[PDB]
Every structure is written in structure tokens, then in C-alpha cells.
């Protein structure tokens, strides 16, 4: 799978066609990285685009469902196999940071 | 050429299981022919016709009796048993003159070698034919991996006699 | 990383005598920061001008071992023969392993051969490896293959033979 | 122990990779097949107009309608492999004539044809890069050449019509 | 078919913490709770020995829930069920529509107020399609005890003939159809012991659809050309209005 | 047929010590464990009295495993499950392929990197065909308890519609297809009591195959001439590309 | 069943065609003897050739499965009937030697 690369801050890239495209194992990385970031009832063309944030960060007691939905999004991605993810800090102020690790379809060629 | 063999070997059974006549079915055939069983070798133990042949030849009547023995379908070795050939002195056995022997202790080869390899210098006192006492003062046993090698070393050391391991 | 480092510009005999002592006026920031003398603030003085440590021996591994709790080590440069027993003893005395590779010239069992000297000395923690070319990396991967068992699951203790290396 | 032999010996199961007789025999079979593999691989190397000598050249001639018989006499390329009659072509000359003929087979009356292959490109890499075609006035086709070609050869090509030529042609010295 | 599809759409139903019950009616107790994954594996020994696989036909999962409903249920630890949002105007895209005068606009306003009264009920129904409880709603009347509420909600769901979403622990299955609902009332306990078997209505998409689930504002917009059967308008009676007087002349 | 075949292929499934579970998920407890060898013996008294035997038609073995899954299972004595090797390039035989120039090679490299991304998933799937657990993998997320893991693995195996290998003690049967999976959750134990019936997919080879199971590197190489049905290319629409401009002239 | 004899060290034999072939009861002996020796994922033409050694002598706790797989290979051999096999030494250094005895289809003619 190809996909246009995004630069550091994550804006789009035009020019260098066929070269601003991520090849693989990093295309999966980019595609998971910003599949997580796709609020659900945003896109009128995909209203279940990805997990529903306005209804999960605005309600108490969803950490388990945040994690289950992140695993859902990641696993249902073209190119990933497994996941290994949990929470690493405990809302250091009130923001919790979770650690997400997944095995792409690559690095399994032995 | 690192062979497969050093991770698995598959060979044919060699010694006749080396068992002893313990059970009831330890049956014997007594010969009287001083071919191979002389006095002090009064018996030999077998569990197959071919071995009796190789010690006795398919021609001698003793191998014939072994052949008609093992040919019985439920023969003794099928129920924890052995055949043994004896020897009664039929007529005027002539025992050839022997030479003096010295059989050492049963050494396991897993303990003799590790103890030997630390022994730099050698030290023996042996006597052959009651001659002058022979002292052996250098046996660099360090380079030894099996009892055959210490056997060779002793063979080179003890003058007037031959050393074997068995 | 949450530390406050304060370095003088000049190098060599440049003591920062103060640990941020109390001033004559103004609420004291020193104690709350952690720079305070009673506080646990390291105050390594400016070392003298350029200092030459001498050229140590491979026994300088002790300095690593007395800092890291390494449990298996290798040397990029091959341990000299004359220094193998020492490190070998070291391997036992510090409850660790040391992996070292040797080339073809050491496939003997004489006393002068250092690996066999290790074997006789019982230095079981000084693991010796063989690489015909001299390819040192064989040790690292070997090390990288051994210290790989999570000692909490069932029967995770692995042998070594016939395992993929790098 | 090249690639072919090594990759094929992996089909010896490991009871038989190390027994010397068996390994030698498998290597014998693999080697005899390997000479065919090498032949197929080197067919391309040894067939084209460049690395061709003797009969294959003649074959190329008869595939490009140019026999070594030009019926003309050209001086010798005195800088053994093969000798012909005087009024034939030593190999190297006949090689590079066949290259020119191959060019003129795929000619076109355009010096920079964008759709089809031009005259200029094909005559230029006919001579491996020592020719240069520029038109004239009465449909002259002026043709610059590097000095590494004797006048005898080129005047012969023009006198045998092997150079690419739609209607009219000429040379320059 | 693919082995990859397994994990992918096995996680496609994630149970929210709020623990929808039989569709939002969690006010009972689940005495037992089962699901039945079944499969049809054709029996006889498969034909080739090389590739004649792909012969495990799937089946509609059933989910059986037997529980009890009492007048007074005290729920231990579960988050409130909050009304789902009306995200219909997310893509609503006006301002390309024509400029038309006042009381030409307002005539449209009256038409809209006129048929919203007839469509908005089913519009809410489809908005709340999976979950019938907050569609029917808390009964709200103090006369009806809790068993009233359970029975009338169950009858509403059953007569509704619309699939509901049912949550077994660890899964909130999305389209369960009420297959069997048996409430029992012993003469030694005032509660109601009810067994409800649901069956999933699994249905995949045959045709090319670039958009999985769009807004209502573009759902018809991205729809492919739908097909209706033929019919003989010349042979209709229920609407055989005469020709308009404005046409006979013209 | 033959009496000799009995012992021969009765031992053809040998249970490894590692004790694969329902396919690698051994993290439950086997309350009961059954297999059902069945046979069809035609009933009426066989015809001749001399040779009219060979009339015991075999049957697909079923294997029933009912067990329980808890949040905390402590396994007593079983060896780790190690990832199976990727022995695909065992016979991979290059170096007869043509000599082609750079960026003619590298163009192939880009094509390979381009469709490996689309094939390697199913390639791993077929590499791990029997055992789905290490395909789906340990869940790896700390949020999902152990019953999460059992349910989502079972659903992945069930929706996978691929046969798995199932181990009853003393046998690790190679191609079991999940027939029925019923997990039950009483209201007096937080665990899940599950009954899973599998049915073997036994299939023999009709056609002459000298090689039993080759590498992927020669599996197509030794394949016999496969057959596809006919079709009318002149009557296709989904790809009716025009004639290439390079051909109309030629 | 015929099969080319192998000499003592086990290399192949050519020449004396139709005479370097083992006839029977010894052809079974040779064929079992080196069926045991056929590592599994060796032969690209038979990747389940025989029992898997790189994955049985490289893992702890397989003696029972070594024995079961040896019985599998031996029993599934054209010409054998029964087996009678067990372990005779106990890794005298660390190498265990097992004793394998099988009844060929011969010697059952009474």
C-alpha cells in the first residue's frame, strides 16, 4: 500500500509525485497513526470513520473502552497483525498517555 | 564436513545385549570338543544362532545344536532366557602355556580420564619375570581422551610386557 | 531531565564553592531547588587540567562489573592467552558469564592451550567458543542467543544446540 | 562452487550431502546440467553483432541481407581466429557493416522523429557514436564522421547502399 | 474465506461500558447468558488434496438470555445511558440551492413543517434503530410497577419487528432479532423469569460502495441507481384523475 | 480397505509435548474432552459368503471439548509455544533466471515491495494454517482481561472459517473445523463455561502426486496442469478497455 | 522392494547394477535405518519427509515425543509390522542412546 507522506507537523505533501508516497511498514505506521486520530461522526462520507472521541473523552469511565476501541482500530488496519498496548502514565495532570505497540505484517520474514 | 551423524547416529546392535543367566530359562548344551571352550573358559552365553556359529562354525555339531535350538518358534530367549555352551573334558585337554596377566579395576572412563588429565608426570613400579624393579617417572597423561590412549601410554612405558585395554 | 546543572565557563581548578547558600535578603530559592548544601546536590569540582589515566588491563572489566551488574560479557578485542585464567576466575567470582572465541590453533588438549587450562581449572563460567575464521561476532550472537529465557514461565529453560544465530 | 551448483545441492537430503561419493555424484549431475544453464545464460552474451565471429556473423548477414561478399577490395585491419578471401570482409569490418545495415533497416526520413525512430539516432548508434547527419540543399545528406574510420570503408558503404538513404545521399571530408 | 478476516471483524462489536441490556432495558438480572456460534461443515471427505478448502459456511449467531425481573431492581455499578446525538446535519450542504423569493421560501417552510409531522417519527426511529429502549423510553408513569415496564417494553420490542442490539458481557452485538421471549411467573415468587433468544441479522454488502455509512445528509446522495419493477400506469384506477383542464387545450 | 492402513495412519497425528489447545489457546481448563469415531456399516446381510467385504465406510471424527475460562488461569506443566519457522526459501532456486540490467532489476524490486504488501498477509496465514492462535496472537493489551482474550480469539477462529488443529490428550488432530461453540455464563461464577465441537476435515489425494508436501518454492513447480472453466471474453464489460493505440496501426 | 545398498560408511553405490540392490528384510532394515535420519524440513520435495530434528533435539523435554515420532516413522514403513523400542543409556554424557527393535514382514512364515 502506498500513501502520501506527511511531514513532521503532519500537513500534506504535494510535488515529488511517486516519491512523496510512503512505501510500506511505514505506510502502515502512518495509516495507524492517523486512523487513531479520526473522530467518528466527523466525516459525512464515513460517519463511523473511526472511534468516537467526542463521546469517549467527554464521559467518565471509558478508559477500558478507549483501549478496546484503539485496539479495534489498529487491528482492523491493512497491514498490522497484533498489538501490545496499555497505559504508561496515570493522567500526569489529567491527560493519560497510553503506549501502543503493534507488529506490522513485515518483520515476520525470518 | 560436519555430518548429520554428530546430532544423530543410527547403527546396528553389536553386543549380544550382554545379559546373565538370572531367570529360570538359562539352558545349556554341554560339548566335549576343546575347540574354543577350554578349561577356565567353561561356558559361553548366547542369544542367537549366528554368534554360536561365529564362535563355533556352522560345521561343528555344537553350532548345529544351537541351530536346532533357536529354530524352535517359542524358544527360550523369547521369555527371558539364554543359551549357554559348556565344556566337559572329553579327552586330554592340553592347556597351552600362558603368560602372566594383570587385570585392573573396572574403570568407567568417565572418571579415570578427568583424574588422569591433571597428572603431568608419571610414576610406576612394575616387575616382569621377577627382573630388576622398573620405575616409570614420566607419563604426560594430559593429552588423553579415552582409555585406549592411556593403554597405549602404559604399553610404551612398561618394558618387557604389553598393555591393552578391554 | 528534572536536574539543574550549573557549569562554570572556565575549565580546570574552577570550584563552585557554593551549593547555593542562603542570601542576606529575599525568600530563599536555594533549598527548594535542591542546589542546597544540605540537599542531595552533587558538586563535582572542576577537575584539574587535562589528566592522563594510564593504560589498564582487561581486568578493567571489574570497573564495568562494579557499575552495571552485567551478567554476560564479551570483549571486542581478543583476550590475550596470558590473561585468560584471570578473567576466567573473575567470571566465577562475580556470578556472571564471559564469552570468548578462539581460532583453529586452539583445538588441542595440552596444558598450554588456554581453553583446556580453563576446563581443568573448572572455570565453568568462562564460556569458550570456536570460530575458524576468527569471527569474533560469533560470541555476541551466542551471548545474544543464551541470555534469552524469561525465568518465570514453565520450562522456559532452553538448551543451546541447534538454535539459529546471527 | 557457483550459484547453480550450490542452490541445486540443497535438494540432496542431509543423509547424502556429506557422504563423499554421493555428494560427488550429485555434483556430477548438477554440473552436466549446469553447462546447459551456462550455455543458455551466455547465448545472449555470445550471439549479438558485437560478440559474434565467424558463422553467427554470416547468419546475421543472412538475417539482415548482407553477405560478407561485397565483391570489393578493402585494405586490411592490421592492428589468429579466421581468414577469408581478399575480396571478402575480415570479421570486424563485417560486424560493423552489419550494424550499419541493421540501422538502415529501421531508417526513417526524419532527423529527430519523435514518434518513430529517426535517421539521426539510428545512424549515430550504428557507428557507435561516430557519425552525424545534416541535410543539404538539392536533397543532399551531408554526413560528418570521426577520423577513426578510413575513407575506403565509407565510400564503399555509399557505393553499396548500406547507409540509411531515403532518396539521396552524400558524405563529407 | 480469509483467515485475516477473523480477528478483523471479530472485534467489530466492542461492548461499551454503559452495558445496554436487551436494548437498553438493563433493569433485570441475568440468571444465565449464552451465545451459540454454529457452522455448517459439509460432511463428505473433501475432494482434492491440494486446494479444495474454503468449505466452512458460517451461521447466524444466536444469543440466549434468561433472567428475572422484579418490582425493585438495584443495579450495582453501571454508567448512565445517555441519549445518542442527532448527527444528521453533519454534512448538510445548502447554499448551492437556488435563490427563491420570500413566501416562495416560506411556502417551502410550510411544506416542511407539514410533512416533518409525518416523517420525523420514523426518522427518529432510524436514528435510534439499534436501541429501542430510549426510543420507547422510560415509562414515566408512577402507576405501572417495574414489571409493567419490563412487559410493555418487551411487547413493544416484539411487535416492533425491528432488530435490536443485545449485550452479552464482552460483546454488544449490533443487530439481534428477538426470536423467542418466554416470561414465566411461578406461584412462589412475584418476579418474572424470562428467557429471550435473539438471532443476529448479519448482512454484508454485495455491491461497490465507496462510503461505508454516511450521514443522512449524503446517504441518498451517494446511493447508486436504485431499481424498481415495471408497472402498467395506463391500467391504474386508484388515481385515475382526469386530464387537467389546463392541458386539454394546453 | 486395507487392514495395514489402520496402524499406519492411526499414528499419523502425534501429539507434541507443547499441547496446543483449541489451536494454541490453552489458557482454559478442559472439564470434559471427547472424540466420536463413527462408521456407516450398511445393514442388510452382505451378499456373497466369500469376498463381499470392504463395506465399512468411514466417517468424520468429531471432537468435543467443554471447559471453563477464568480471568486467572495458572497452567501446571506445559512447554512454551514457539513460533514456527518460515521455511519457504528451503528450495528457492534462483540463478537460472535471466541476466537483466539495473533498474530493470530494481523495477522488479519495486514491484515486489509493491505486491508483498498485498500478499504477505495471506502467505503468513497459509504458513500458520493449522494453528490460528499465533496468527491472531496474544492480545497484548492490558485492558482486555483473560475472558476478553478467550472470547475474541474464539470469535476470530469462528469467523475465520478456516480449519484449526485441536489437541485431545494423546492426539493433536490436524484439521478440525469449528462446528459449535457455546459459551455460557452462570450468575454464580464469573468464569465462562464453553462447549466446542470440532469436526475433522479429512481429505485424501485422488491424483498422482509424487511429492507429498513440497516447499512453497516448488509447490507450484510440481503442480499438475490445473483446469479452469471456459468463459466468453468477447462478452465482458468490466474491463472492456479499448484497443491500445500502439496496435490499431501496429 | 529393492533399494541400492549403501556401504559401511553409508555413501552411495554405483556399478554392479541389479546387484547393488538390497533384496528384502535388509532393504527394510536400510530403509528404516535412514528414514530415522531424515530431518523434516530438509527436502524441498518432501518438507514433512520424516521427523523434525532441528525442533526436537533443540528443545528441552521431548524424549517422549522423540520416541513417539521414531515409532511413527518406523511403523509407517513399507515392510515393518511391530516395534519394541526404549532408551538404554541415560545421556551417558548428554547423548542418550535408544534401542529400537522391529519385526519386519519377514520371519512370520512359521
mmCIF file of N, CA and C in Angstrom, chain F residues 195-246:
data_model
loop_
_atom_site.group_PDB
_atom_site.id
_atom_site.type_symbol
_atom_site.label_atom_id
_atom_site.label_comp_id
_atom_site.label_asym_id
_atom_site.label_seq_id
_atom_site.Cartn_x
_atom_site.Cartn_y
_atom_site.Cartn_z
ATOM 1 N N UNK F 195 -18.537 -25.008 25.500
ATOM 2 C CA UNK F 195 -18.510 -26.300 24.831
ATOM 3 C C UNK F 195 -18.238 -26.064 23.356
ATOM 4 N N UNK F 196 -17.211 -26.710 22.822
ATOM 5 C CA UNK F 196 -16.818 -26.538 21.433
ATOM 6 C C UNK F 196 -16.709 -27.902 20.776
ATOM 7 N N UNK F 197 -17.555 -28.144 19.790
ATOM 8 C CA UNK F 197 -17.484 -29.332 18.958
ATOM 9 C C UNK F 197 -16.762 -28.966 17.673
ATOM 10 N N UNK F 198 -15.715 -29.711 17.352
ATOM 11 C CA UNK F 198 -14.988 -29.613 16.101
ATOM 12 C C UNK F 198 -15.236 -30.872 15.295
ATOM 13 N N UNK F 199 -15.059 -30.769 13.987
ATOM 14 C CA UNK F 199 -15.205 -31.915 13.110
ATOM 15 C C UNK F 199 -14.032 -31.949 12.155
ATOM 16 N N UNK F 200 -13.379 -33.098 12.060
ATOM 17 C CA UNK F 200 -12.197 -33.200 11.224
ATOM 18 C C UNK F 200 -12.557 -33.024 9.764
ATOM 19 N N UNK F 201 -11.692 -32.330 9.041
ATOM 20 C CA UNK F 201 -11.823 -32.234 7.600
ATOM 21 C C UNK F 201 -10.776 -33.157 7.012
ATOM 22 N N UNK F 202 -11.141 -34.416 6.829
ATOM 23 C CA UNK F 202 -10.237 -35.407 6.272
ATOM 24 C C UNK F 202 -10.398 -35.381 4.764
ATOM 25 N N UNK F 203 -9.299 -35.219 4.039
ATOM 26 C CA UNK F 203 -9.359 -35.264 2.586
ATOM 27 C C UNK F 203 -8.085 -35.847 1.999
ATOM 28 N N UNK F 204 -8.251 -36.897 1.197
ATOM 29 C CA UNK F 204 -7.165 -37.637 0.578
ATOM 30 C C UNK F 204 -6.917 -37.138 -0.842
ATOM 31 N N UNK F 205 -5.857 -37.658 -1.450
ATOM 32 C CA UNK F 205 -5.414 -37.221 -2.767
ATOM 33 C C UNK F 205 -5.881 -38.219 -3.818
ATOM 34 N N UNK F 206 -6.716 -37.753 -4.741
ATOM 35 C CA UNK F 206 -7.194 -38.609 -5.815
ATOM 36 C C UNK F 206 -6.126 -38.844 -6.870
ATOM 37 N N UNK F 207 -5.322 -37.826 -7.172
ATOM 38 C CA UNK F 207 -4.498 -37.797 -8.374
ATOM 39 C C UNK F 207 -3.052 -38.110 -8.028
ATOM 40 N N UNK F 208 -2.325 -38.622 -9.020
ATOM 41 C CA UNK F 208 -0.908 -38.934 -8.900
ATOM 42 C C UNK F 208 -0.103 -37.708 -8.499
ATOM 43 N N UNK F 209 0.457 -37.728 -7.298
ATOM 44 C CA UNK F 209 1.356 -36.673 -6.836
ATOM 45 C C UNK F 209 2.613 -37.328 -6.297
ATOM 46 N N UNK F 210 3.747 -37.218 -6.981
ATOM 47 C CA UNK F 210 4.964 -37.847 -6.452
ATOM 48 C C UNK F 210 5.421 -37.225 -5.152
ATOM 49 N N UNK F 211 5.224 -35.917 -4.996
ATOM 50 C CA UNK F 211 5.675 -35.170 -3.831
ATOM 51 C C UNK F 211 4.490 -34.950 -2.903
ATOM 52 N N UNK F 212 4.657 -35.334 -1.641
ATOM 53 C CA UNK F 212 3.561 -35.227 -0.687
ATOM 54 C C UNK F 212 3.277 -33.775 -0.338
ATOM 55 N N UNK F 213 4.252 -33.099 0.263
ATOM 56 C CA UNK F 213 4.109 -31.697 0.638
ATOM 57 C C UNK F 213 5.433 -31.002 0.382
ATOM 58 N N UNK F 214 5.527 -30.219 -0.681
ATOM 59 C CA UNK F 214 6.778 -29.543 -1.004
ATOM 60 C C UNK F 214 6.846 -28.169 -0.358
ATOM 61 N N UNK F 215 7.968 -27.499 -0.589
ATOM 62 C CA UNK F 215 8.098 -26.123 -0.152
ATOM 63 C C UNK F 215 7.157 -25.233 -0.943
ATOM 64 N N UNK F 216 6.965 -24.018 -0.447
ATOM 65 C CA UNK F 216 6.334 -23.016 -1.288
ATOM 66 C C UNK F 216 7.163 -22.748 -2.531
ATOM 67 N N UNK F 217 8.473 -22.973 -2.460
ATOM 68 C CA UNK F 217 9.331 -22.648 -3.585
ATOM 69 C C UNK F 217 9.174 -23.620 -4.739
ATOM 70 N N UNK F 218 8.583 -24.786 -4.513
ATOM 71 C CA UNK F 218 8.396 -25.734 -5.602
ATOM 72 C C UNK F 218 6.963 -26.237 -5.634
ATOM 73 N N UNK F 219 6.105 -25.692 -4.771
ATOM 74 C CA UNK F 219 4.738 -26.197 -4.705
ATOM 75 C C UNK F 219 3.994 -25.983 -6.009
ATOM 76 N N UNK F 220 4.173 -24.832 -6.641
ATOM 77 C CA UNK F 220 3.580 -24.615 -7.941
ATOM 78 C C UNK F 220 4.386 -25.300 -9.020
ATOM 79 N N UNK F 221 5.681 -25.463 -8.770
ATOM 80 C CA UNK F 221 6.552 -26.056 -9.774
ATOM 81 C C UNK F 221 6.163 -27.497 -10.060
ATOM 82 N N UNK F 222 5.821 -28.263 -9.020
ATOM 83 C CA UNK F 222 5.424 -29.652 -9.198
ATOM 84 C C UNK F 222 3.934 -29.807 -9.401
ATOM 85 N N UNK F 223 3.185 -28.718 -9.416
ATOM 86 C CA UNK F 223 1.750 -28.828 -9.590
ATOM 87 C C UNK F 223 1.432 -29.368 -10.972
ATOM 88 N N UNK F 224 0.405 -30.198 -11.046
ATOM 89 C CA UNK F 224 -0.031 -30.691 -12.335
ATOM 90 C C UNK F 224 -0.868 -29.618 -13.025
ATOM 91 N N UNK F 225 -1.150 -29.833 -14.307
ATOM 92 C CA UNK F 225 -1.843 -28.827 -15.102
ATOM 93 C C UNK F 225 -3.242 -28.567 -14.566
ATOM 94 N N UNK F 226 -3.429 -27.432 -13.907
ATOM 95 C CA UNK F 226 -4.723 -27.117 -13.331
ATOM 96 C C UNK F 226 -5.696 -26.680 -14.407
ATOM 97 N N UNK F 227 -6.980 -26.815 -14.108
ATOM 98 C CA UNK F 227 -8.033 -26.590 -15.085
ATOM 99 C C UNK F 227 -8.996 -25.528 -14.589
ATOM 100 N N UNK F 228 -9.288 -24.559 -15.439
ATOM 101 C CA UNK F 228 -10.358 -23.616 -15.182
ATOM 102 C C UNK F 228 -11.400 -23.751 -16.277
ATOM 103 N N UNK F 229 -12.612 -23.352 -15.955
ATOM 104 C CA UNK F 229 -13.687 -23.468 -16.906
ATOM 105 C C UNK F 229 -13.546 -22.485 -18.044
ATOM 106 N N UNK F 230 -14.448 -22.621 -18.996
ATOM 107 C CA UNK F 230 -14.483 -21.706 -20.106
ATOM 108 C C UNK F 230 -15.114 -20.390 -19.725
ATOM 109 N N UNK F 231 -15.041 -19.452 -20.661
ATOM 110 C CA UNK F 231 -15.638 -18.136 -20.500
ATOM 111 C C UNK F 231 -15.560 -17.419 -21.833
ATOM 112 N N UNK F 232 -16.457 -16.457 -22.029
ATOM 113 C CA UNK F 232 -16.624 -15.775 -23.307
ATOM 114 C C UNK F 232 -16.005 -14.393 -23.224
ATOM 115 N N UNK F 233 -14.707 -14.251 -23.470
ATOM 116 C CA UNK F 233 -14.086 -12.944 -23.284
ATOM 117 C C UNK F 233 -14.683 -11.892 -24.175
ATOM 118 N N UNK F 234 -15.170 -12.268 -25.351
ATOM 119 C CA UNK F 234 -15.755 -11.268 -26.222
ATOM 120 C C UNK F 234 -16.955 -10.588 -25.577
ATOM 121 N N UNK F 235 -17.535 -11.179 -24.534
ATOM 122 C CA UNK F 235 -18.724 -10.643 -23.883
ATOM 123 C C UNK F 235 -18.440 -10.204 -22.455
ATOM 124 N N UNK F 236 -17.337 -9.503 -22.248
ATOM 125 C CA UNK F 236 -17.024 -8.924 -20.955
ATOM 126 C C UNK F 236 -17.141 -7.410 -21.020
ATOM 127 N N UNK F 237 -17.615 -6.830 -19.932
ATOM 128 C CA UNK F 237 -17.782 -5.394 -19.831
ATOM 129 C C UNK F 237 -16.900 -4.759 -18.776
ATOM 130 N N UNK F 238 -16.584 -5.476 -17.699
ATOM 131 C CA UNK F 238 -15.902 -4.855 -16.575
ATOM 132 C C UNK F 238 -14.487 -4.439 -16.922
ATOM 133 N N UNK F 239 -13.959 -4.902 -18.041
ATOM 134 C CA UNK F 239 -12.629 -4.495 -18.424
ATOM 135 C C UNK F 239 -12.508 -4.216 -19.902
ATOM 136 N N UNK F 240 -13.598 -3.805 -20.550
ATOM 137 C CA UNK F 240 -13.576 -3.612 -21.998
ATOM 138 C C UNK F 240 -12.775 -2.353 -22.323
ATOM 139 N N UNK F 241 -11.488 -2.413 -22.008
ATOM 140 C CA UNK F 241 -10.582 -1.370 -22.451
ATOM 141 C C UNK F 241 -10.513 -1.373 -23.969
ATOM 142 N N UNK F 242 -10.362 -0.187 -24.546
ATOM 143 C CA UNK F 242 -10.236 -0.089 -25.986
ATOM 144 C C UNK F 242 -8.958 -0.784 -26.443
ATOM 145 N N UNK F 243 -8.776 -0.851 -27.756
ATOM 146 C CA UNK F 243 -7.522 -1.352 -28.299
ATOM 147 C C UNK F 243 -6.425 -0.325 -28.099
ATOM 148 N N UNK F 244 -5.256 -0.787 -27.665
ATOM 149 C CA UNK F 244 -4.156 0.132 -27.424
ATOM 150 C C UNK F 244 -3.841 0.898 -28.695
ATOM 151 N N UNK F 245 -3.531 2.180 -28.539
ATOM 152 C CA UNK F 245 -3.198 2.982 -29.705
ATOM 153 C C UNK F 245 -2.012 2.403 -30.453
ATOM 154 N N UNK F 246 -1.141 1.671 -29.764
ATOM 155 C CA UNK F 246 0.014 1.093 -30.433
ATOM 156 C C UNK F 246 -0.336 -0.099 -31.310
#
